[PDB]
């Protein structure tokens, strides 16, 4: 096979990754200008973590009650707020690493890289998608609270994702950098589960259009389907219902190999309702839908 | 539990981005790797189309001076002081040393052994992965234009092991190179000529290190009560086109066999099993398919 899942490089977040601790508790903090980046819920004692009242606990704790370390280099809280779900500590500088950056908010389907950190520092990188259930896979060894889920572009990196919590189930859950949670889960301990996920049928039609343009063409069919009918078989196999806003997203690939939306939709119909009959698609046994349709026109 | 959910994670890949820089032989682009003030690249960058059926690279090289190497770093050229070739990398000597360059290494892995690449195209940082060398000492890369001079490394506590750089895609699709001395890693040559990867096989010494990292996390459905010779293992394992397992592999996974309590026969015998049944929509750490890029070396650190 060839097509191999690529994260970005992570060189440019790496530069600004800190690590903050409140109290007993220490996780990691995305250093940017003169403003570190953190989830709230450090602040939290083990009393706190029932039912806290944030923005009055953190209105009453002083600066110096952060601590701030890049590298071996302690950075001064001058300042503190909070916005949603994420802590704003201001610092006295600003990081001169500080890259080009947006703050974004994803949707679920959409892919990113998310730079584990421990302690404020890197351990490595990986690729993912916003499951349809608003987590993400990665276990506790693939990064703790405060690493960032990130895209870039040109030279411009947008943050998307920070991490929150790990759920028992082996995926994490998390807000954009805004503090907004993807998903409906809340920054206390508490009994939380994800919802049962789905599928991202776009992605998986993304790969099938990438596997053509590799020239594996074995379950292309002359048939085509309704947008409807389509979607009464993929739901029964946990696929996600496929929007008309999904067809548009790939009209590009449609364009690039001649295969209509609707017509490769009745190929994956039919590997869905038949399998792939001891058959590879660019070398793999699995349908992968972690790739989106930008995905491919960025690496095919 | 610790594993639940694992994702493969390449290195952190800053370290590595601050060395990469393009060199440009003639009409001929590609990535090179600047450390200290030598700039490492794949010596086909000094051949044209032409000579990369038959090249000649002593008679090609002896014709290039310094002036004919054009070496850049963002918008800054670097100017090449000298040349010269080791097995199939060649090294330019340029007037500056790269401030970034990282504490480092060269290093010869074997197959089996996993790094991050580092995919770039002229001299730019795409993307990075995980893999592992293949059995058939090829490794399946990206999509892929000109790549080549992309590198492979581990880092250890800030140290940069550098063990592969890109020097051609077979026509099978899949990639091979050299280490940082320029020796090719299987029987391949730096030279267009019909050249096919052997048979690829599983690296069942890192399926068996994923099953006790299962086990590890109270991951247990595939375990069954047998265990069985390492010769039974081998025969049914080739034939499932699995690398047949040596005493050294037993003792590697030693380790993981005394946390879990399970003989690595009996592992041996599980993994047998999965052969035989296949995963049909089950997981194993929440992976629908058996990995086999992720080392003994790896589970025995993260599962301490
Ligand atoms: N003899 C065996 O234990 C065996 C292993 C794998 N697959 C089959 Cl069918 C049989």
């Given at each position: 096979s060839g097509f191999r899942k690529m994260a970005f490089p992570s060189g440019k977040v790496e530069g600004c990754m800190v690590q903050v601790t409140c109290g007993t508790t220490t996780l990691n903090g995305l250093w940017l200008d003169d403003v570190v980046y953190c989830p709230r819920h450090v602040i939290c004692t083990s009393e706190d973590m029932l039912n806290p009242n944030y923005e009055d606990l953190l209105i009453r704790k002083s600066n110096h009650n952060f601590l701030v370390q890049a590298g071996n280099v302690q950075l001064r809280v001058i300042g503190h707020s909070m916005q949603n779900c994420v802590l704003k500590l201001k610092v006295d500088t600003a990081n001169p690493k500080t890259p080009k950056y947006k703050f974004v908010r994803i949707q679920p389907g959409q892919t990113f890289s998310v730079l584990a950190c421990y302690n404020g520092s890197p351990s490595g990188v990986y690729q993912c998608a916003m499951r349809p259930n608003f987590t993400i896979k990665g276990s506790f060894l693939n990064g703790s609270c405060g690493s960032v889920g990130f895209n870039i572009d040109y030279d411009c990196v947008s943050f998307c994702y920070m991490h929150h919590m790990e759920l028992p189930t082996?995926?994490?859950a998390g807000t954009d950098l805004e503090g907004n949670f993807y998903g409906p889960f809340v920054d206390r301990q508490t009994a939380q589960a994800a919802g049962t996920d789905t599928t991202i049928t776009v992605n998986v039609l993304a790969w099938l259009y990438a596997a053509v343009i590799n020239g594996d063409r074995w379950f292309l069919?002359?048939?085509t389907t309704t947008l409807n009918d389509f979607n009464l078989v993929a739901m029964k196999y946990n696929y996600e219902p496929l929007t008309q806003d999904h067809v548009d997203i790939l009209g590009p690939l449609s364009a690039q190999t001649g295969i209509?939306?609707?017509?490769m939709c009745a190929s994956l119909k039919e590997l869905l309702q038949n399998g792939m009959n001891?058959?590879?698609?660019?070398?793999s046994a699995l349908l992968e839908d972690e790739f989106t349709p930008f995905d491919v026109v960025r690496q095919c």
């Open positions: 082996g995926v994490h069919n002359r048939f209509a939306v609707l017509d001891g058959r590879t698609i660019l070398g």
